[PDB]
Amino acid sequence: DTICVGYHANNSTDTVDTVLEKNVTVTHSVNLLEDSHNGKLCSLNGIAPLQLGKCNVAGWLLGNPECDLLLTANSWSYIIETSNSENGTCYPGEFIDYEELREQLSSVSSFEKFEIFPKASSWPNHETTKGVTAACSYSGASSFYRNLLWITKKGTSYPKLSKSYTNNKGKEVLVLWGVHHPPSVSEQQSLYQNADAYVSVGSSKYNRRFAPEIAARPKVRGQAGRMNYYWTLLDQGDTITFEATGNLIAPWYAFALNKGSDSGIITSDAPVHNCDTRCQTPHGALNSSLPFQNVHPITIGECPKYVKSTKLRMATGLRNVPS
C-alpha cells in the first residue's frame, strides 16, 4: 500500500515561450493579445460618424457644389475621409493654415450653420449674382461655392465697402472668407476698376490688411487667377469688421461650435454599418478586454494598447508531461 504523490497531466497543445527554452507545452494558459476585428465602421456610443465620401474637409466647409449631399450634417463622432476624396478647393489657390483648422475640428462635436450676411439684403450697392467662374462647374452650368459670395461692380461703380457683425450666441463662431487676385491688370480693372485695392479684417486679436498681387502664371483647371482662403474663431462678445475696396469674397454662412473632445479624421474606406462599439480603427472595430492590441496604432475610443508582437501567451499552470 502506497501514497504515491504526483501532479496533473492534460492533453492540451498550446505552447508558451520562456527564457531558457522555447515552445514549452503548458496545461493551462491565457491569451493577452488581440487579432480579430469586424471589417466595419460602427457608431461610437450611439452617435453615427459623418462620412465625407468624395469630399475633402476644405471642400465640405467651403461648400464645394459637388459636395451637396452632406449639406445638412451637424453632428458626428469622428470624420471619415476615403482614398477617393479629392473635391477640395475647386477654384485653384491655397487654404492658409489648413492643418491648424483640422486640429481645431478634432475637438468639436456639432454645428449650427446660420446666415451672417443675408444675400438679398446686406449688399444694396454691388452686384451679387452676376459673378461666377466656370472652373467650379456643376451639371454644365457655372456655380460658385455654397458658403461664400463673389462681389462684382454695379455699372462702372464701386463704393467703399464696410460691414460689421457682433456675436450674440454664447458659443464660438468660425468665420471663413477669401481674397481673389487676377493674373492681369486688365482683368483687375475689368472686374473692380481700382488700380489699387485692399481688404482689411479686424476684431480684437485678429488684424490684417490684405493687398492683391498681380502676376502672370501658368493656369490650373483653365484659370490663371488665384484665390486665398482664411478663417478666424470669434468669442462670445467681440465683433468682427470687414472693410474692402475691390477684393472681397464675403462670408455667407458661419458655424457655431460645441465642445466635447476625442474626435478624429480617420482615413479609410471600409463600409459603414450601425452597430455600437467603444473602440474604432481604420481597419475595423474591436470588442475585447485584453491589455494588448495588434490591429492598428491609430484608434478612437477607449481602446486596448498597441504593441508590435505576434504572440503573448502567458502560462497559468504546469508543464504538460504525459507519462
Binding site: 500500500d1 502506497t2 501514497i3 504515491c4 504523490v5 504526483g6 501532479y7 496533473h8 497531466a9 492534460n10 492533453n11 508558451v16 515561450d17 520562456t18 527564457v19 531558457l20 514549452v24 491565457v30 493577452l32 489648413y98 492643418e99 483640422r102 486640429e103 478634432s106 476625442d262 474626435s263 478624429g264 479624421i265 480617420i266 491589455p291 494588448f292 496604432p297 491609430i298 484608434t299 478612437i300 475610443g301 477607449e302 481602446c303 486596448p304 494598447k305 498597441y306 504593441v307 508590435k308 508582437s309 503573448l312 501567451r313 502567458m314 502560462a315 497559468t316 499552470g317 504546469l318 508543464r319 504538460n320 508531461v321 504525459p322 507519462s323
Partner: protein
C-alpha cells in the same frame, strides 16, 4: 531555480487525475487512488489569479491617437513626430515581451516548488515508516485501511498509534 520535482525524481504526470493540480494515489486493500488535494491547490489558484489580475492592472488603455498633418515646409516637425511615435512603440513592445518571458519562468518554478513542498510535508509526518522509494512513493510497514489514508491526506497521522507494530515489522524484515 529548478526544484527537481517536476520531470525530476517524479517522472511524469497523471491523466486520470481530474479535479485539482496536486494530489495522491492510495493503493490499500480496497480500491485505487487518484484523489486531489484541495488545500494546496487553492493557494496556487489564488496566487496565479492575483498575478494575472495585477499584470492586467499595471497596464493602461490608450485614448484617441489620431495622426496629424503637415505641409512641405514643416519637415523637421514631421520627422520629430514620427521619431516620438516610433520610440514609444518600441519601448512598450520591449516592456511587454520581457514581462511575459520573466513571468513564465517564475510561474513554472512556482509549481515546481509546490510539488516539492507537498512531498516534504508527507515525508515529515511519516517519520521512520514506509521506506520511500523511486518517484515519490511509500510502502507502509504497518497495514492500515482507508482511514489512515484519509488521515495522511488531512495532515494528522498520530504516529504513536502505529509505532510499535511498524517497528516490529521493520526489525523482522
Amino acid at each position: 531555480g529548478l526544484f527537481g520535482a517536476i520531470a525530476g525524481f517524479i517522472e511524469g504526470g497523471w491523466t486520470g487525475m481530474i479535479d485539482g493540480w496536486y494530489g495522491y494515489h492510495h493503493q490499500n486493500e480496497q480500491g485505487s487512488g487518484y484523489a486531489a488535494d484541495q488545500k494546496s491547490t487553492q493557494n496556487a489558484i489564488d496566487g496565479i489569479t492575483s498575478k494575472v489580475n495585477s499584470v492586467i492592472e499595471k497596464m493602461n488603455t490608450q485614448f484617441t491617437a489620431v495622426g496629424k498633418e503637415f505641409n512641405n515646409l514643416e519637415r523637421r516637425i514631421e520627422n520629430l513626430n514620427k521619431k516620438v511615435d516610433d520610440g514609444f512603440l518600441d519601448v512598450w513592445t520591449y516592456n511587454a515581451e520581457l514581462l511575459v518571458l520573466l513571468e513564465n519562468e517564475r510561474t513554472l518554478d512556482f509549481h515546481d516548488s509546490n510539488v516539492r513542498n507537498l512531498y516534504e510535508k508527507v515525508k515529515s509526518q511519516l517519520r521512520n515508516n514506509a521506506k520511500e522509494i523511486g518517484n515519490g512513493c511509500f510502502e507502509f510497514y504497518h497495514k492500515c485501511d482507508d482511514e489512515c489514508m484519509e488521515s495522511v491526506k488531512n495532515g494528522t497521522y498520530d504516529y504513536p498509534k502505529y509505532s510499535e507494530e511498524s517497528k516490529l515489522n521493520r526489525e523482522e524484515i
